[PDB]
Amino acid sequence: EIKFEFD
Amino acid sequence: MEFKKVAKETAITLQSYLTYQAVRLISQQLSETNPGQAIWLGEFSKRHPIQESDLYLEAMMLENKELVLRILTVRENLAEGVLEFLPEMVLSQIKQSNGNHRRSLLERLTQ
Amino acid sequence: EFKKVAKETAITLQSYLTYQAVRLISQQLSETNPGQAIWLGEFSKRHPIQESDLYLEAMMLENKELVLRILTVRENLAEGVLEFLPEMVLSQIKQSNGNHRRSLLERLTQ
């Protein structure tokens, strides 16, 4: 898994 | 009002998201086509916050230029296949989530 | 064609808008009641806004008034913003694609 997150 | 700033931030985040989403689809293919490439990509993705689209891509340049070009293409295909359906889907989903949440809590008060 | 990617993107967009709502409200609070802004600050450390329904639910155990305020603001933000994004992101990606392409090809030279 490559994760996406909003800073 | 002035929902313009929020829109700028949202569009940026979306751009980065779709990039992520391309990198994802590509890595799916590599895991099946060129497993070493696939794992390379993972190890790269860990060194670089993919949600910094541009930083991510500028860094990638310096290491695997063919892949960078591929992402830019895959992301834009995704962008076109997906964007029009978004305002409906989100607004509709928000209304629904809004519904359930209100019911849930407005009823939780009687408990 | 890419329905499963539409699903995941909308879900993100939902949570992102929830996030953005918590961010306006957090600014108002920081003026109005400092006490709650601090609280909302650390609430967001204990619960990831990116999984927004779980976030709102957890908040219900603590500040139901706010959960409700979030729901209203997030839908407003949605209304103001959603219909604009597909022109915006597209034309942005295109631009970006252009600049990355130019920049990559010019490195092959220099």
Query: Is B14 exposed, middle or buried (CB count within 10 Å of its CB: 0-12, 13-18, 19+)?
Result: buried
Kindly list the distances between the CA atom of residue B88 and the CA atoms of B93, B94, C94, C100, in Å, as whole numbers in the listed order.
Answer: 8, 10, 23, 31
Give the A window 1-7 contacts with B, CB below 8 Å. Answer: 2-7
**Residues in C 50-79 with any Cβ partner in B closer than 8 A:** 52-53, 56-57, 60, 64, 67-68, 71, 74-75, 77-79
Look up residue C94 and give its two tokens: 């295109």
**Cα dist. C54→B76, B91, B105, C50, C51 in Å?**
32, 19, 13, 9, 6
Distance from CA of A2 to the nearest CA of B (A): 7
The architecture in CATH of the region C1-110 reads Orthogonal Bundle (1.10)
Report the amino acid identity of residue B12: I
A7, amino acid identity? D
Structure obtained using:
X-ray
CA distance B40 to B6: 35
Q: Where are the domains of chain C?
A: 1-110
CA B20, B21, B22, B28 torsion: positive or negative? positive
Could you tell me which CATH number the domain at B1-111 has? 1.10.1200.210
- Resolution of this entry, Å: 3.0
The angle, 0 to 180 degrees and rounded to 10, between the axes of the packed helices C52-60 and C3-32 is 40
Neighbours of chain C (3+ CB pairs under 8 A): A, B
